[PDB]
Amino acid sequence: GAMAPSYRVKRMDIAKNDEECVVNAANPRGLPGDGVCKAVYKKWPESFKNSATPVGTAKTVMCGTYPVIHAVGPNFSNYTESEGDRELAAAYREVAKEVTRLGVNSVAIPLLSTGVYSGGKDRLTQSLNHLFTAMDSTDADVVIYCRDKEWEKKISEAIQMRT
């Protein structure tokens, strides 16, 4: 575990992370996809061997010795608000199990279901709170990656406000 487990946020490409493992915002079929999933495919393509996994689950595949945890958030275009919320909470609980199993001291994580799976809604607070519910009991250093300047400020404020 990390000596003083922390949350941090960075505004940059998660493909350039400085952590011991990465969470992919995957699709259920293990396809290259778009956004975070596409950048992960370009950086760790070997990790997409047998990566297909259902909504609300996480599956780790090693790229050399570097773990890629494929976490499948719901597409809120397809799910009701209620069922989507349950599956989004579940995907993050499976991330916490994988991070613990791997024994890593740090993990890079995107906000699941906030991009093209958001069903056109702002889900920063919803996705972040489910991330916290899952990861709070882990002792890894968590580094959240985002691309938008106003999302970086809002994530940073939510972190510091618990400290």
Q: Please report, as residue ranges, which positions from 43 to 82 form the binding site for Cl ion (by CB under 5 A).
A: none
23 is in an annotated binding site: no
CB atoms closer than 10 angstroms to residue 102? 15
Taking Cα atoms as reference points, which of 58, 55, 162 lies closest to residue 107?
58
Task: Work out whether strand 58-63 and strand 66-71 pair parallel, antiparallel, or are unpaired.
Answer: antiparallel
**CA gap 130, 91 in Å, rounded:** 9
Applying CB under 5 A, does 119 fall inside the site for Cl ion?
A: no
Distances (CA, A) of 130 to 30, 80, 125: 23, 17, 9
Shortest reach from residue 40's CB to Cl ion, in Å: 12
64 annotated as ligand-binding:
no
- Residue 116 annotated as binding site: yes
The residue of the chain with the least Cβ separation from Cl ion equals 115
DSSP-derived secondary structure letter, 34: S
At position 14, the amino acid (one-letter code) is I
Query: Is 117 marked as binding a ligand?
Result: yes
Q: Which of 81, 122, 136, 148 binds Cl ion (CB under 5 A)?
A: 148
Residue 113 DSSP one-character state: T
**Per CB under 5 A, which region of 9-17, 53-61, 91-99, 123-131 contacts Cl ion?**
9-17
Query: Least distance in Å: CB of 35 to Cl ion?
Result: 6
State yes or no: residue 134 binds Cl ion (CB under 5 A): no
* Nearer of residues 93 and 102 to Cl ion, judged by Cβ: 93
**Cα separation, 117 vs 28, whole angstroms:** 12
Q: Which residues bind Cl ion (CB under 5 A)?
A: 12-13, 115, 117, 146-148, 151
Binding residues for ADP-D-ribose are 13, 27, 35, 115-117
